[PDB]
Structure 1
Amino acid sequence: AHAFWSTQPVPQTEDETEKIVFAGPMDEPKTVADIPEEPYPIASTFEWWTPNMEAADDIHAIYELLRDNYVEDDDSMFRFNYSEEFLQWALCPPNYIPDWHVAVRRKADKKLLAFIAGVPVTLRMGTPKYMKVKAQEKGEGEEAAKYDEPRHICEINFLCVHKQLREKRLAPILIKEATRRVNRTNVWQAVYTAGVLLPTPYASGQYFHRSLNPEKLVEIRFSGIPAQYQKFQNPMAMLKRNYQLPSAPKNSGLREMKPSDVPQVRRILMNYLDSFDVGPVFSDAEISHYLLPRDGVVFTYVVENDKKVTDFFSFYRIPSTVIGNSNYNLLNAAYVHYYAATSIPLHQLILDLLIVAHSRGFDVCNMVEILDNRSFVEQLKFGAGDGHLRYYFYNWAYPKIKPSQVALVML
């Protein structure tokens, strides 16, 4: 049933994943010398291209492919519209490898037909907490702890085939070529997320939304009006009142993060993330990259009293195109990013995030139920949405974990 994925070093069934007891590789061990320097074969009317992700024209090419042909929601009403600036942020973190940005162009007219990108990530992906107990009783602790150290691996994202080339088995070719490029640098595992079920996720979480601008959400059909509110003279005023927020946070100490905050943010972030089974390890340079504010892209605030940072939150922007002819409505969505609370309950910190996002003109706040995200759903009036984000590894056997054991936000 999976002509491509049955050929690949990933768990092949759910049952397989449920029985895995230790973290570890799946494939035969290999050296760089084992991997071909010649690119993967592709039909003669097409060519590999490595866009320069800092060149204006290349980023613009990638932007338009994704704007027109990237992820749509489960109901085909919205499509992600990542900005050019967001793409350069997401794809060019510290020590990124330009060669991991892979495109296919038609030779004759240089039309961009497809894309996939890897970026480096340092990830903790050793045997979980619940799995280390069972292997202690059994005394097999060394096998279970063999891969505890954070590993320098690849994060895959932005796989896209042009709408007009769908179902032609081009996606497997991009994946093989990415894999080859990555293997050439002596990296053997990858992590990826998708809203579709593939063989075979190690974790899966529902996404959740919090209305900030209900009127717009109803107009573009993201939301409907609650039946219960339909029973009133002004259903929309009821709905607006429900989701209404303060115009500013009464949380004293909140300000935008700045460069001087990088070390303390790193410390409080890493202290928190280290409590989850699967999670990133960030250098100072990576904290800087992913969390320092960038206009229209990433927004990050710290609670600081007397030059001591005790809490922070971050969110990023991806607007969704509202699909339709001559429809210029944009769902301007804020996504919950990393955060850490030490001085205030997490729900108070995230209320501040909703307040700020609403102030900055966001229509909705979205998140997946990873981290401690479920702990503030009800009070902050999040609801579950119709999608699920599944988490996968390539060439890594991993026992099934709950999404609340996952600490990697994928963009």
Structure 2
Amino acid sequence: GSHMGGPIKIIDPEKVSKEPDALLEGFEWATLDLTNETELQELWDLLTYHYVEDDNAMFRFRYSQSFLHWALMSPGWKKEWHVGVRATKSRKLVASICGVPTEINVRNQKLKVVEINFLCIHKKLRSKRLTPVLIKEITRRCYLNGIYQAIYTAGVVLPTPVSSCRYYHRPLDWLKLYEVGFSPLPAGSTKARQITKNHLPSTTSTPGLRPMEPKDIDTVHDLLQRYLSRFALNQAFTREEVDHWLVHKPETVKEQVVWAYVVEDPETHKITDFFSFYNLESTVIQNPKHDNVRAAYLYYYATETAFTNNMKALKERLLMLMNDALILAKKAHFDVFNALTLHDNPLFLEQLKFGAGDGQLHFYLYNYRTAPVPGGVNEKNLPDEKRMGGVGIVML
């Protein structure tokens, strides 16, 4: 045993069944080959019309083939972790659950895990308890390949979250967000006044800031590992993951999904900071004027300033950098910039006019117990500088 936590069940891979369990009559297992446009496009269609985490929302995600490729074919990916269910007689894809491999540090300990997402069941098949069946089959496939833990997030509370982080939203085009009914008009205020309140300039302020290039990978990999190692729960990137997750490839990528910038110090020419964000659009269900909201999501970032252990200095450096990330998202035509209260986010959220959203994201670990980790928020569910150092991993 151990007073530090660790696995719940020890698994012998040689004792795991090599055949899957039987599904409901009329249905069969499928392994998706996402390198085939036809199957990619079946998955796109199931998610487009059935992946609605909250039917109460006024927006739905709108995927691109590029976002799907970026999200599901990361380094080490295996086709057998893209699991589907088909109707035998029509061949129609009606459920999915997918995993990709990586490594995370959970307090003292490094673990190989899969990140699980895109769990989705067609509306016609809801409430048949298919979920535990999907979960048990991708588990079996991971166990056979030597992976016995997983990490996932959900908007709903399930047994023992390791952490919870609150949604925050910085309007970039306030007038459009007011028109789609995302933002109300405050008491006593006018449109002109909210437009003025949320206005940003068109030029950045941090000297040396430019888009990340392939030749930066090694230095950003190293800055990012040292930066993330300040958090209890963090992702342990390899150099190939930095390449896949952070560096846009225009020859390869139809629609840019990820924006990464570095600051190359002008005096020294060393990279001292970087930040990145990704693009995921939302369709607006019922609106006379707009069809979509283009949302940027804050992803990974780092700064050398964090290692002077001067918190005040770190805060100022992030206010400057994150203000320029807002300016750059706004120039690339995003409507809203989303962030969570993880990493060192509580240092800048409020000051940069991010507003509290109505929603929380919970982190879970499968087959592993560890003490809970602070999610950047206090008792009142507001951001709190004393509640950081916990969650150093972002999920798509």
Do Structure 1 and Structure 2 share a fold, with TM-score over 0.5?
Answer: yes
In structure 2, the partner of 1:137 is: none
In structure 2, the partner of 1:152 is: 112
Cα shift readout 1:81-126 (whole Å, capped 9, x = no counterpart): 2211111111111111211110111111111111111110110013
Counterparts of 1:94-105 in structure 2, within 5 Å, are 94-105=75-86
Q: Of the candidates 317, 323, 337, which is equivalent to residue 299 of structure 2?
A: 337
Counterparts of 1:37-186 in structure 2, within 5 Å, are 37-73=18-54, 75-126=56-107, 148-186=108-146
Are residues 1:408 and 2:393 paired?
yes
Q: Of the candidates 160, 179, 183, which is equivalent to residue 223 of structure 1?
A: 183
What's the CA shift for 1:163?
2.0
- 1:332 alignment partner AA: R
- The 3-state SS of whatever aligns with 2:304 is coil
In structure 2, the partner of 1:292 is: 247
What's the CA shift for 1:332?
0.8
Q: Of the candidates 257, 278, 303, which is equivalent to residue 233 of structure 2?
A: 278
Q: Of the candidates 182, 193, 196, which is equivalent to residue 238 of structure 1?
A: 193
Alpha-carbon distance in 2 for matches of 1:325, 1:362: 18
Matched residues, number:
365
Alpha-carbon distance in 1 for matches of 2:224, 2:103: 15
Tell me: CA distance 1:211–1:326, structure 2 relative to 1, closer, same or farther (3 Å). Answer: closer
The answer as to whether partners of 1:23 and 1:125 remain within 8 angstroms in 2 is no
Tell me: CA distance 1:75–1:239, structure 2 relative to 1, closer, same or farther (3 Å). Answer: farther
Tell me: CA distance 1:325–1:354, structure 2 relative to 1, closer, same or farther (3 Å). Answer: closer
More moved, 169-178 vs 301-310: 301-310
In structure 2, the partner of 1:132 is: none
Are residues 1:387 and 2:365 paired?
no
The answer as to whether partners of 2:67 and 2:257 remain within 8 angstroms in 1 is yes
Are residues 1:269 and 2:221 paired?
no
Tell me: CA distance 1:246–1:279, structure 2 relative to 1, closer, same or farther (3 Å). Answer: same
Cα shift readout 1:10-59 (whole Å, capped 9, x = no counterpart): xxxxxxxxxx95230012x2211211111121023111111112211111
Alpha-carbon distance in 2 for matches of 1:327, 1:119: 38
More moved, 174-183 vs 302-311: 302-311
The answer as to whether partners of 2:259 and 2:278 remain within 8 angstroms in 1 is yes
- 2:324 alignment partner AA: D
Alpha-carbon distance in 2 for matches of 1:155, 1:355: 31
- 1:151 alignment partner AA: L
Alpha-carbon distance in 2 for matches of 1:90, 1:408: 15
Alpha-carbon distance in 2 for matches of 1:23, 1:109: 47
Tell me: CA distance 1:398–1:321, structure 2 relative to 1, closer, same or farther (3 Å). Answer: same
- 2:342 alignment partner AA: I
Cα shift readout 1:237-262 (whole Å, capped 9, x = no counterpart): 11111110011213221111110000
Q: Of the candidates 26, 31, 50, which is equivalent to residue 8 of structure 2?
A: 26
More moved, 108-117 vs 300-309: 300-309
What's the CA shift for 1:327?
8.0
- 2:345 alignment partner AA: N
Tell me: CA distance 1:44–1:75, structure 2 relative to 1, closer, same or farther (3 Å). Answer: closer
Displaced runs of 4+ in structure 1, greater than 3 A? 71-75, 324-328
The answer as to whether partners of 1:72 and 1:78 remain within 8 angstroms in 2 is no
- 1:26 alignment partner AA: I
- 1:204 alignment partner AA: S
- The 3-state SS of whatever aligns with 1:153 is strand
Are residues 1:353 and 2:325 paired?
yes
The answer as to whether partners of 2:208 and 2:263 remain within 8 angstroms in 1 is yes
- 2:99 alignment partner AA: G
Cα shift readout 1:177-233 (whole Å, capped 9, x = no counterpart): 11111111111110000001111201111110000011111111111111131xxxx
- The 3-state SS of whatever aligns with 2:29 is strand
In structure 2, the partner of 1:320 is: 282
What's the CA shift for 1:285?
0.7
Q: Of the candidates 251, 257, 264, which is equivalent to residue 212 of structure 2?
A: 257
> What RMSD over aligned residues (CA atoms) do the two structures have, in Å?
1.7
The answer as to whether partners of 1:256 and 1:302 remain within 8 angstroms in 2 is yes
| Unpaired runs of at least 5, structure 1 | 1-19, 127-147, 230-234
- 1:324 alignment partner AA: Q
TM-score when scaled to structure 2? 0.89
The answer as to whether partners of 2:31 and 2:82 remain within 8 angstroms in 1 is yes
Cα shift readout 1:306-334 (whole Å, capped 9, x = no counterpart): 54211100000111121238886111110
Alpha-carbon distance in 2 for matches of 1:245, 1:327: 24
TM-score when scaled to structure 1? 0.85
The answer as to whether partners of 2:205 and 2:320 remain within 8 angstroms in 1 is no
- 1:98 alignment partner AA: K
Q: Of the candidates 345, 350, 353, which is equivalent to residue 373 of structure 1?
A: 345
Q: Of the candidates 135, 154, 157, which is equivalent to residue 197 of structure 1?
A: 157
Alpha-carbon distance in 2 for matches of 1:243, 1:327: 21
- 1:178 alignment partner AA: I
